[PDB]
Design a protein around this ligand. Structure first.
Ligand SMILES: Cc1cc2nc3c(=O)[nH]c(=O)nc-3n(C[C@H](O)[C@H](O)[C@H](O)COP(=O)(O)OP(=O)(O)OC[C@H]3O[C@@H](n4cnc5c(N)ncnc54)[C@H](O)[C@@H]3O)c2cc1C
Ligand SMILES: Cc1cc2nc3c(=O)[nH]c(=O)nc-3n(C[C@H](O)[C@H](O)[C@H](O)COP(=O)(O)OP(=O)(O)OC[C@H]3O[C@@H](n4cnc5c(N)ncnc54)[C@H](O)[C@@H]3O)c2cc1C
Lengths: 112, 112
């Protein structure tokens, strides 16, 4: 908009960035790309703006390190992580089998 | 609404994340944090989902590496980077002296 992001706005926008990032990550990433994405996620968890949120995500990420082996493993890992936060906030579980429809290709019914 | 984000949508929300990220970066970051934020930016530039956009930012970063010494230096560095992209796309130059109002504290006129 025009004013500082609130917790929810920052969240929606960051998840959008993260899921899209994962959606276009290589299906066949090189060993270096796999190392970089894992490190990116690690650093991300240390600087995500919302203080309370970062403390929370770090604990979740340390418990289940990102699997950056492939586009699918990574996008699924990220979907599972987001779902953990969804459950913490009483939000619905997202069907991870549809992450590509949501963030890359659009719903199969063509509503996008 | 819940559809894959186009170049403009992704960009808008990613800049929001990035500027908020810089807005809350420590005023006195540890050397470790300064190293981490620099790498975050470098990895970010290699994976940002819009290939043309990623290549462009990489070229700009290579000419002026991120200054992660302080919250102010980094926020200003990021504002300058975004302004280069604005100039490229014919968008108005943003007054970097007002980055804190825009992304952290809100406009001085209490508008927010
Ligand atoms: C790393 C991180 C940590 C956070 N921690 C906290 C916290 O501790 N406490 C707190 O109050 N808030 C936290 N937030 C904010 C919170 O997650 C939400 O972003 C915010 O409440 C806004 O919710 P929303 O309903 O708009 O959807 P999100 O912003 O919840 O939703 C983004 C959208 O993505 C889709 N989506 C939902 N789940 C998934 C999934 N699993 N996989 C793929 N797509 C999905 C949906 O289409 C949805 O509308 C965090 C955000 C991030 C990015
Ligand atoms: C790393 C990166 C690279 C990109 N590369 C390209 C590219 O090569 N080609 C292309 O077409 N698009 C590119 N984009 C997309 C483009 O920059 C815009 O995000 C998009 O056109 C939408 O524009 P917008 O007008 O909504 O504002 P941005 O999305 O331009 O604006 C976000 C908002 O932030 C504020 N703002 C503007 N400038 C600054 C600043 N300098 N400092 C602090 N706040 C500011 C404003 O309040 C503005 O409305 C890129 C985005 C990112 C995040």
């Amino acid at each position: 908009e025009d004013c500082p992001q609130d917790r929810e706005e920052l969240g929606r926008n960051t998840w959008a960035f993260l899921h899209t990032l994962a959606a276009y990550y290589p299906d066949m990433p090189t060993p270096e790309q796999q190392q970089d994405m894992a490190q990116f996620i690690h650093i991300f968890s240390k600087f995500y703006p919302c203080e309370e949120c970062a403390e929370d995500i770090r604990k979740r990420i340390d418990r289940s390190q990102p699997d950056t082996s492939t586009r699918v493993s990574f996008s699924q890992w990220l979907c599972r992580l987001h779902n953990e936060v969804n459950r913490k906030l009483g939000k619905p579980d997202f069907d991870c089998s549809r992450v590509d429809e949501r963030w890359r290709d659009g719903w199969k019914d063509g509503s996008c």
